Design a binder for this molecule. Structure first.
Ligand SMILES: CCC(=O)Nc1ccc2[nH]c(=O)n(C3CCN(Cc4ccc(-c5[nH]c(=O)c(C)nc5-c5ccccc5)cc4)CC3)c2c1
Length: 411
């Protein structure tokens, strides 16, 4: 009984390129709030809804800055606070939208304690608008963790709900072998803390830079583990990762891939007066253009990662952001003659500009990629169960080994 409760034209600010764009948005009773460049011909697609666009448990804010008649939808998704800001031309339209959005969200409602004293601060990993991420070490075990310290006012209003939030999120199917697990969750008076396992086998950009290129065998191994992880998020969790890049890949002590969740939403840097947020080299085209996106965005990100592992170079690159966008949006990917046809077939399939034509963009999602001839001979149950031996063993003997945190990291 999924139906549209409200629809119309809005002005949405770009998530990575901060400019306003007219978008036709659909609000549905299941919580999805998705916008399109133009009105779609199909009202509801058969595939399962994605939480990235859901309105459940949102906070509605009406602001007059930076632009009057702005309203902001703010949600905690897993451990990251994401914001979507919109603008309508009249205050009367904003109330109609915010009321409809609120009614959909309300209709969807339906030691012994861990403290900050148990951890030793080591290093700041990142600062964001709604908190920061720090590298810590638990004093009792010596194991290293990334702690997301988020402002509590932004997320939940009541201390009783935040206690259930810390209590639930630890157990809510955190575990897939190649996703960084969320281990502890606690709160202070004004902060919400998420403690995640930190892999000590070295960042993947570190390993790729010193060995310059991975062979097709070694890239097939990491690529198979990433496929397995992304299949879990899409089918089991109905979430698109969207931030798949080399900087978010690490190895554990054994050499298996860990996809990290250490990010936080920031306000970008100011193209003299244009505010860009982060680097665009890994963004799917449909993400750059603020068009509707789905599970195909991760397969583009897989393509970028696979391309850099096997070619030793980012697929598209230019110092000017204006020229870069055209490279990502228009220029076709080119391959060195060293790549075999199976590597080229997979990479060109993953980097198709049109998401509906992209490898893995159909209704079968990850199975199109698992059956691709590049992954021939890969037993996918053995990938999940870590029965494949890693082709590279990081130079650590324990998980408290700090070698990839020492100043040998400079080499
Ligand atoms: C200027 C732009 C900026 O700086 N930030 C920004 C702005 C707008 C955004 N919109 C939006 O979606 N994101 C980001 C939201 C966060 N994901 C990353 C992400 C996505 C899903 C999850 C995630 N989820 C889940 O449920 C479960 C069980 N496990 C994971 C999970 C856990 C461990 C390892 C991997 C996945 C964890 C992290 C990246 C995109 C935005 C970020």
């Amino acid at each position: 009984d999924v139906a549209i409760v409200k629809e119309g034209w809005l002005h949405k600010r770009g998530e990575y390129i901060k400019t306003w764009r007219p978008r036709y948005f659909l609000l549905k009773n299941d919580g999805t709030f998705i916008g399109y460049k133009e009105r779609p011909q199909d009202v509801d697609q058969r595939e399962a809804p994605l939480n990235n666009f859901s309105v459940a448990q949102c906070q509605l804010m009406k602001t007059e800055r930076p632009r009057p008649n702005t309203f902001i939808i703010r949600c905690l998704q897993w451990t990251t606070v994401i914001e979507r800001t919109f603008h309508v031309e009249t205050p009367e339209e904003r109330e109609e939208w915010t009321t409809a959005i609120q009614t959909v969200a309300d209709g969807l409602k339906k030691k012994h304690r861990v403290t900050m004293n148990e951890f030793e601060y080591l290093k700041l990993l990142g600062k964001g608008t709604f908190g920061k991420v720090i590298l810590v070490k638990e004093k009792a075990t010596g194991r290293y963790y990334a702690m997301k310290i988020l402002k509590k006012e932004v997320i939940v209003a009541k201390d009783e709900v935040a206690h259930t939030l810390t209590e639930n999120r630890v157990l809510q199917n955190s575990r897939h072998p190649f996703l960084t697990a969320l281990k502890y969750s606690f709160q202070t008076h004004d902060r919400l803390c998420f403690v995640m396992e930190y892999a000590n086998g070295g960042e993947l950009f570190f390993h790729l830079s010193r060995e310059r290129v991975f062979s097709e065998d070694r890239a097939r191994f990491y690529g198979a583990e990433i496929v397995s992880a992304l299949d879990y998020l899409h089918s089991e969790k109905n979430v698109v990762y969207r931030d798949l890049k080399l900087e978010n890949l690490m190895l554990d002590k054994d050499g298996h891939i860990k996809i990290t969740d250490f990010g936080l939403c920031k306000e970008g840097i100011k193209a003299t007066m244009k505010t860009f947020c982060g680097t665009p080299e890994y963004l799917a085209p449909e993400v750059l253009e603020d068009n509707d996106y789905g599970r195909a965005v991760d397969w583009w990100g897989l393509g970028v990662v696979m391309y850099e592992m096997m070619c030793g170079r980012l697929p598209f690159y230019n110092q000017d952001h204006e020229k870069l966008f055209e490279l990502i949006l228009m220029e076709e990917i080119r391959f060195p003659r060293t790549l075999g046809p199976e590597a080229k077939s997979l990479l060109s399939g993953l980097l198709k500009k049109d998401p509906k034509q992209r490898l893995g963009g159909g209704s079968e999602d990850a199975k199109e990629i698992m059956q691709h001839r590049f992954f021939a001979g890969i037993v996918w149950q053995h990938v999940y169960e870590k029965k494949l031996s890693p082709p590279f063993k990081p130079q650590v003997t324990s998980e408290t080994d700090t070698r990839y945190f020492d100043e040998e990291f400079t080499a």
